[PDB]
Design a protein around this nucleic acid. Structure first.
Lengths: 197, 232, 134, 190, 170
RNA sequence: UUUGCUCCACACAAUAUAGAUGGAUACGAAUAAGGCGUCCUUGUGGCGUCGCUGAACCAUAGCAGGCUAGCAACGGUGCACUUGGCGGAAAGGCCUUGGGUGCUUGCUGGCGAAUUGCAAUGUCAUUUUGCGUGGGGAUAAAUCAUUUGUAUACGACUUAGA
RNA sequence: GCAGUCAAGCGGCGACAUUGCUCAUACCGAAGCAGAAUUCGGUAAGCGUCUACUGAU
RNA sequence: AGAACUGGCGAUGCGGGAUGAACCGAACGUAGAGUUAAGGUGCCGGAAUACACGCUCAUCAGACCAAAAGGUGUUAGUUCAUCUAGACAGCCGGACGGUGGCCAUGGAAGUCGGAAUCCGCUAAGGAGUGUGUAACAACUCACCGGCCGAAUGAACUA
RNA sequence: GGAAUACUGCCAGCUGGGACUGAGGACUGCGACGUAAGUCAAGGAUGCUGGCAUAAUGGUUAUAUGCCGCCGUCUUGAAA
């Protein structure tokens, strides 16, 4: 329905978000993920942090370079989870992965475009109340990520100047509502209500 | 699980249970038909050796064996439960310690004994000390200097933590003797004794308080009067 | 002086009026007669025509309206109280109930009726936009 | 049994006022103000008659119910602190080496300095948390008094003072130098 | 959805012993065929008569008289497990006996891993008077003006995407 | 260097489309709480009201969207000029003063549709390149060679010159 | 190992109790650890008596 | 291990078992249409991020016999004790006479030690359960009582 | 006191939408409708049409896409 879907990873589960996005990728739908650094994983910090180290151990017994290497960026962590859910090493899998983009925060021009969320992957709607959860930001920093401060610092600048845009939009909508409200009850407006509009 | 682990130290004694109350319950009813006069006592505070002296001061007079709320049921809290006429009104006039006297002695004997009787006692909580005392501003002794300090014995080191912590006074140990830097005023007249204040006097053994059993109501098995020659 | 926010949570209680989400009675109102347990409640909708039965709260959504009703009220009593409270009249006079009618109305619009909406909407747009910019 | 609803009551003396929203709790009274965050405990507040505040949990389990009572204790502590205030007394006794306790204002932090502890050359600095105020006891031998509104700040500062004066691998019985909390009374006791 | 059946067997008659005791019991089953099998199984555990010599005299469904009144049900259940059968008693608040007994099987399977074959329902009786209920979790629902919310409600989304960032409020 | 190179307008061709066939429509934060309007007591304040999905909002009529006459507004909008501002995370885009020129289905009229014969996606966009014109701009370096050592197993690499 | 009493319990069997012979380093907690030195327990397991690789295009 | 009996393979493709002798169903000409066996329905992977009831925080959980017992982990029950004569817990009071019971002996006054562990009144109190002194003293429980206000405590089963 | 409603089972009841098959090749027979003549859904598809007259769908093959997957003999219980 949307040529390019932008998904906000904040408050989502990596496994649920990755699985949902993975199927869409195989279906030809292009998807972009933003604010990956704010993505969350179930369980308290120790379990998530401990499991990441265990995976790092089995990289390669003899030579890490002649094998896999560990990406510290939160986006790569999500990409690794999504990569395992796609038939990599194949033309269909490789082509599907090319339709996916992941960035920390909301780099432009996506900042000026609407972003959606997946209702069936939100932590609020999936995790039991009162249970502990882990955030990729702390996990990524604990494993050597050196850009958490930069992302947080410039993300506030993203948060700023957006409320101003909404503030102008909110005032503009107020004028539209007043213009629409006064125009209501007219002959055309009254007839429209009959047809449900 | 995750519950308080009950603790108990093995001892010869054991709980009495409800069966003890049943004997208590019947004891009061039996006394109403055996003795002539019935009295209720309000000795909110007691001393066992003193109670034995009062109990042993006579043979005919008997202090009823029972529990306050059990006494009410045994005496009867309603006209339909009283063991004798007009007894239900008398029962609801007493509360607290299980004070109650059954005897055949004349009413004049009862009032004369209690009115003249009086004994010393420790300054119990909720009371006001009739005197004031200040601990010496140096090393303290067992009696706190109320008796000559030369004759008094220095306080034992083992009790220092109680004074420092339980009594909150700024005591400290100096060569095995407790010392304070100022003449701490333990209590004074007009103050209501808190548990800490009473304990300090109790530890020093200052029995600066009088004790006597107060009695309010009088009853008889045939006159059934509810007269109350209360004495305080 | 002390202030505590509303915390205006909808509560399941005797006399509560609810809307059925799933089943043969989807879209029909009902009134909770007596709570059975944490998950299951007893409802009655005699005016709505839904027979009295027990339904899990998962298949029912609680509306913000309420009316007095005794616990365990029978069908006759529920209808009497239901009519007296005029919940149906109050229910219809709300945005939540109105939106349901609007969605249903838009579904029955014939292609000819749908075309008329475009003409009417454009005419309203001209007046609305003409009013603005002044 | 998975209690359907468990409730607790908090008595609010007329001298204090409390404002409650999303779980950031503020208490105002004669002695000042206090703030606490309870968003992680998921309790629900309700003002009854401005004198009693109800805290309730719905479908709370045993693990969740146990946390319900903590809210009352923490809120009660804040109410008492703003009304009564907490005063933690400590005494820095020593055997031979006199323990010298002073306050320095390096970078304006008003750090507490401990010197000559058991003859150690190292100078121990104890930070002072916000709200708690230090006042040396007059005419009381080697007594230091800590006062403040927040129990956590006052109590934690006292613990830090005692902990940092630990004797390094020595016979505890023979060595007595240190700082201990002599009392935990209130400021305006009655 | 089980059904309540009444099954009677009379150890097919022989000369000089007409009309035997006609043992009677009530069995809950999804269908008549299942009910008949359970009746034979229970007999062999109590009455040494076997299916070969037994007979089913009649079987009729027992529908609840008033499937509208909320009733507190006291149930005594005997169930088998790794250890010998243990006597068990439970209380369930439900509209009808058939509905109440169904929840018991779910509870037994969850909290005891027992199944239909290993569970023997002894008796189901209504608690006709209040204050006779012993279990705390049943007295819980008897309080006057019992009001409680349903916090953290979740709406099952139909589409895979949502632009509203839905709230769980109720 | 037979005017080589490149920017711009279109003239025709080709190469193909991990796949348009109305619009990726922009706050943040909480989810045991929040949005929009209003008020003064500008605060964790009072009042009104919204959610329970986008089944929404905008847009959408004219030969794949023509040729013409009026009515009422002077607004809406495509295109080229032009003032000013914002956006550096991948800004490569986002907005505003001014007038110019087309449409305006906001409203009422005058003509053409055909024979694609009962349908054939019935061809209406996207990235790259060449040959062509017409109008603009700049119009050089590396290697080999000589030589050299702060290098060098051999390669390789670092010096200097009209 | 062999032999024997007793039993929390399991349903006549039987756990443990029962009788005879046959680290040098560092950080924490306890030790009559006054000091020095030291043992014990835990933590770090630190610390000691055709192709692999590499030059080059 | 070994004597014998009955089945699968041994000559055997097919689907599932992530691959797999001997596992589950199914005994095969080439084709089109529909329903199924076992397996599954978050992606790889074709099929419901279906419904209902409960259950678990695990610092490699869970999906893969050395386990009798330990755990102030969690959830539902079984057998007993008390209960508006006041169940539990929290504070306060009483917590006694013989008696400093008899013996070793500088001393064991209940509490370093050896046999009894008797008795009167009590409201209940052990020649005393611990702390504590050189021995006293002092505090405490077990045992009752006073203020509180309903269910609580002990062992087991899953 | 009388009605339904739910569940089960029946209809040689009615009425649509979708997918594959068009096999046989002059009548012989079993049946239905009609008073009859004759007709029929009754022992297997018939009735019209639109573009291909630029004559292609299609046949072989290189590559690509989704899935599957070293030989001949001889052992033992298959693989080895």
């Amino acid at each position: 329905v949307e040529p390019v879907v932008v998904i906000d990873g904040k408050g989502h589960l990596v496994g649920r978000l990755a699985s949902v996005v993975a199927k869409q990728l195989l279906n030809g739908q292009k998807i972009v993920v933003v604010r990956a650094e704010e993505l969350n994983i179930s369980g308290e910090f120790f379990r998530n942090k401990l499991k990441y180290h265990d995976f790092l151990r089995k990289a390669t017994a003899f030579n890490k370079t002649r094998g896999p290497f560990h990406f510290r960026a939160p986006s790569r962590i999500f990409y690794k989870a999504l990569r395992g859910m796609v038939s990599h090493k194949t033309a269909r899998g490789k082509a599907a992965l090319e339709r996916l983009k992941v960035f920390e925060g909301i780099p432009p021009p996506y900042d000026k475009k609407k972003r959606v969320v997946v209702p069936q992957a939100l932590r609020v709607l999936r995790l039991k109340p009162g249970r502990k959860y882990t955030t990729l930001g702390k996990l990524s920093t604990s494993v050597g990520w050196k850009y958490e401060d930069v992302v947080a610092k410039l993300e506030a600048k993203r948060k700023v100047s957006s409320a101003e845009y909404y503030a102008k939009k909110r005032a503009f909508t107020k004028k539209v509502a007043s213009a629409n409200a006064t125009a209501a009850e007219s002959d055309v407006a009254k007839q429209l209500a009959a047809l449900g509009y | 699980r995750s519950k308080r682990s009950k603790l108990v130290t093995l001892a010869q004694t054991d709980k009495k249970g409800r069966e003890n109350k049943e004997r208590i319950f019947d004891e009061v009813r039996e006394a109403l038909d055996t003795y002539r006069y019935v009295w209720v006592l309000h000795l909110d505070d007691v001393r066992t050796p003193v109670l034995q002296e009062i109990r042993t001061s006579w043979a005919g007079s008997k202090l009823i064996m029972g529990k306050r709320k059990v006494l009410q049921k045994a005496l009867g809290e309603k006209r339909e439960e009283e063991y004798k006429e007009n007894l239900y009104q008398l029962s609801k006039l007493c509360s607290g310690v299980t004070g109650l006297l059954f005897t055949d002695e004349d009413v004049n004997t009862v009032k004369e004994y209690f009115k003249s009787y009086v004994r010393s006692d420790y300054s119990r909580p909720n009371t006001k000390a009739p005197l004031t005392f200040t601990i010496p501003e140096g090393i303290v002794y067992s009696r706190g200097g109320q008796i000559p300090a030369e004759e008094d014995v220095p306080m034992i080191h083992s009790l220092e933590p109680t004074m420092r912590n339980k009594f909150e006074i700024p005591t400290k140990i100096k060569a095995g003797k407790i010392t304070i830097d100022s003449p701490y005023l333990v209590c004074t007249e007009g103050e209501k004794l808190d548990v800490r204040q009473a304990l300090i006097l109790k530890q020093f053994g200052i029995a600066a308080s009088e004790f006597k059993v107060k009695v309010s109501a009088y009853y008889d098995n045939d006159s059934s009067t509810v007269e109350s020659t209360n004495i305080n | 002086d002390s202030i505590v926010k509303a915390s205006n949570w909808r509560l399941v209680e005797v006399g509560r009026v609810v809307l059925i989400k799933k089943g043969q009675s989807a879209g029909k109102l009902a009134a909770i007669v007596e709570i059975i347990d944490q998950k299951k409640v007893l409802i009655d909708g005699p005016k709505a025509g839904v027979p009295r039965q027990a339904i899990n709260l998962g298949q029912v959504v609680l509306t913000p309206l309420t009316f007095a009703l005794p616990r365990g009220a029978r069908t006759a009593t529920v209808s009497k109280k239901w009519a007296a409270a005029a919940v149906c009249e109050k229910w219809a006079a709300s945005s939540w109930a109105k939106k349901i009618a609007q969605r249903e109305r838009r579904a029955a619009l014939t292609d000819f009726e749908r075309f008329q909406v475009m003409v009417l909407r454009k005419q309203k747009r001209y007046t609305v936009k003409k009013a603005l910019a002044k | 049994m998975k209690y359907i609803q468990t409730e607790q009551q908090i008595e609010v003396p007329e001298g204090v006022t409390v404002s409650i929203k999303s779980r950031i709790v503020k208490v105002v009274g004669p002695r000042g103000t206090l703030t606490k965050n309870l968003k992680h405990i998921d309790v629900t507040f309700t003002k009854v008659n401005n004198q009693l505040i109800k805290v309730a949990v719905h479908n709370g389990g045993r693990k969740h119910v146990a946390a319900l009572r903590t809210v009352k204790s923490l809120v009660d502590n804040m109410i008492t602190g703003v009304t009564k205030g907490y005063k933690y007394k400590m005494r820095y006794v020593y055997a031979h080496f006199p323990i010298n306790v002073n306050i320095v204002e390096k970078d304006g932090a008003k750090f507490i300095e401990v010197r000559n502890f058991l003859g150690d050359k190292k100078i121990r600095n104890v930070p002072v948390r916000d709200g708690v105020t230090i006042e040396f006891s007059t005419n009381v031998k080697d007594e230091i008094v800590l006062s403040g509104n927040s129990v956590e700040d006052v109590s934690q500062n006292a613990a830090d003072l005692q902990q940092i004066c630990r004797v390094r691998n020595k016979d505890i019985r023979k060595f007595l130098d240190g700082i201990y909390v002599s009392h935990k009374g209130f400021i305006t006791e009655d | 959805h089980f059904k309540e059946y009444q099954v009677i067997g009379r150890r097919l008659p022989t000369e000089s012993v007409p009309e035997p005791k006609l043992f009677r019991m009530r069995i809950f089953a999804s269908n008549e065929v299942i009910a008949k099998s359970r009746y034979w199984y229970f007999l062999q555990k109590l009455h040494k008569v076997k299916k070969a010599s037994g007979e089913i005299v009649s079987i009729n469904q027992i529908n609840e008289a008033h499937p509208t009144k909320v009733k507190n049900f006291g149930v005594w259940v005997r169930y088998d497990s790794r250890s010998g059968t243990h006597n068990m008693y439970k209380e369930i608040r439900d509209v009808s006996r058939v509905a109440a007994v169904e929840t018991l099987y779910q509870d037994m399977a969850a909290r005891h891993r027992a199944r239909f074959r290993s569970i023997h329902i002894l008796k189901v009786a209504e608690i006709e008077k209040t204050a006779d209920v012993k279990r705390q979790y049943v007295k819980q629902f008897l309080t006057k003006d019992l009001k409680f919310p349903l916090p953290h409600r979740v709406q099952k989304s139909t589409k895979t995407f949502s632009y509203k960032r839905p709230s769980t409020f109720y």
